[PDB]
Design a protein around this ligand. Structure first.
Ligand code: ATP
Ligand code: ATP
Ligand code: AMP
Ligand code: AMP
Lengths: 118, 119, 119, 118
């Protein structure tokens, strides 16, 4: 009914910019709210940014201004634009689907985003 | 908290009541905790929605003093708070972040389940 | 059927009431349609479960004459059937196969939602 | 929270036997009921066989006796053993997770099983 395929991520120098995308497929998906959760090595899962079908966004305090979220309704895909990437942004970034400002009903498999100095 | 729904339908203070109406139609929920990210700021139910213009923002009519509960508290402690103050739904917060939700119904059902347990 | 839950928690006639008790604990549902594959055969609620031995099978205490409804029927037609016979939950069947479920509550909420719709 | 990775399938001569497997990962999975749905080219989605965490099985009338379902609780994986494969068993076989005898909450991506005469 609902599938979430994440794309993008990987290495990015500190302070650089990187973008993530998540495609929503399936017949159980009908203009749901999509968002991005992450989880750092030792830390617990945490909301990064979400956006409803209306276009109403919701960011954590921690990536506010740096990260901006957008979605393509016809393609049913969401985009997380990450800028000014601090090393504390290194985590596995999971894509979620659901309803409201904190969608957690359906999850992706997570894509690794590493922010390290070369 | 042995009883709580961790998949929480929340709203932001900048969403409009026209959009909250859609959530009630989509999710069939009576109230929604208002969050900034994951942090609770307010709560809004059907009581506070009817009847204002659809362009009105949540943050202007939501209740700011939210009676919540922590996940380290028993479900029976929430049943006391719900009865002592006559309050429908109780957000569950940890470090000021919404992690679940438990409401009357959710606990009224536990009574009936406990009634039938003598095998 | 504008109102129905298509993710249906069902049971087989060979499951035991000890296992049905687990489903009530896990899903917090009052009744479950009994199916053979996807085909409705009976229904079992908490009424019919208390109190029999945990090894008792569903097919011996379930109701065989199930009052159901079709997805091609309006939700208001089910509200009439639920009130005219005082019946809690109504399975939704198509070609004798369970496709959803609608119950009183599900329709009582629609009344309250329709009350507040003058913008 | 819940992920379902299907394995197996493909070509199989009419009357032959083939097996499918489905691995359930994620923290939202906790001894859920797992089953198999399928969908033929023109037909609609249809239950094949399901099994609860207790081990209680539930088969459709159509694959009854031929198909038998089993699961590994420690590995959280289910197995659909298909025997005497008729050509009408050619379909995309989806793995599902949920509660009860007809779990439909979480779905897989589907694996193609083709039964054709060479
Ligand atoms: N958990 C809560 N914490 C703080 N304020 C709340 C809470 N729930 C509701 N409120 C506020 O109190 C008012 C009560 O009216 P409403 O019907 O919306 O909720 P309720 O009183 O819990 O519902 P009911 O009357 O069915 O119990 C609402 O306007 C809402 O803003
Ligand atoms: N939809 C239905 N179709 C046929 N029989 C039912 C249905 N729902 C319940 N029953 C049977 O009728 C009896 C009614 O008792 P139960 O409390 O279990 O359901 P109910 O009467 O709908 O619940 P309530 O009394 O809360 O309305 C049950 O033993 C059950 O076997
Ligand atoms: N805003 C919400 N988000 C997610 N779940 C909720 C919400 N409000 C209530 N619930 C759950 O859904 C059920 C129905 O809610 P209600 O209709 O408000 O009684 C309750 O048992 C709650 O546990
Ligand atoms: N056996 C079931 N399987 C799936 N959903 C159900 C089942 N029974 C009831 N529901 C739904 O869950 C809600 C609560 O059911 P109840 O507690 O029986 O009123 C209702 O609104 C129903 O739509």
């Amino acid at each position: 009914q609902v599938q979430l395929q994440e794309s993008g991520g990987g290495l990015v120098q500190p302070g650089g910019s990187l973008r993530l995308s998540c495609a929503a497929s399936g017949s159980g998906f009908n203009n749901n709210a999509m968002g991005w959760y992450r989880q750092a090595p030792g830390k617990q899962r945490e909301l990064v940014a979400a956006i409803t079908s209306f276009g109403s966004t919701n960011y954590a305090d921690s990536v506010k201004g740096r990260f901006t979220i957008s979605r393509d309704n016809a393609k049913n895909t969401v985009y997380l634009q990450m800028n000014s990437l601090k090393p504390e942004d290194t985590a596995v970034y999971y894509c979620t689907a659901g309803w409201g400002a904190t969608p957690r009903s359906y999850w992706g498999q997570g894509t690794q985003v590493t922010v390290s100095s070369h | 908290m042995d009883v709580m729904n961790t998949e929480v339908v929340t709203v932001t203070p900048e969403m409009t009541v026209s959009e909250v109406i859609d959530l009630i139609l989509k999710t069939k929920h009576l109230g929604f905790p208002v969050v900034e990210g994951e942090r609770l700021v307010g709560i809004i139910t059907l009581h506070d929605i009817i009847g204002v213009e659809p362009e009105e923002r949540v943050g202007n009519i939501m209740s700011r003093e939210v009676v919540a509960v922590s996940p380290n508290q028993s479900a029976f402690e929430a049943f006391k708070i719900m009865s002592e103050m006559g309050i429908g739904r109780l957000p569950v917060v940890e470090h000021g972040r919404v992690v679940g939700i438990v409401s009357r119904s959710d606990l009224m059902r536990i009574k009936e389940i406990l009634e039938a347990l003598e095998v």
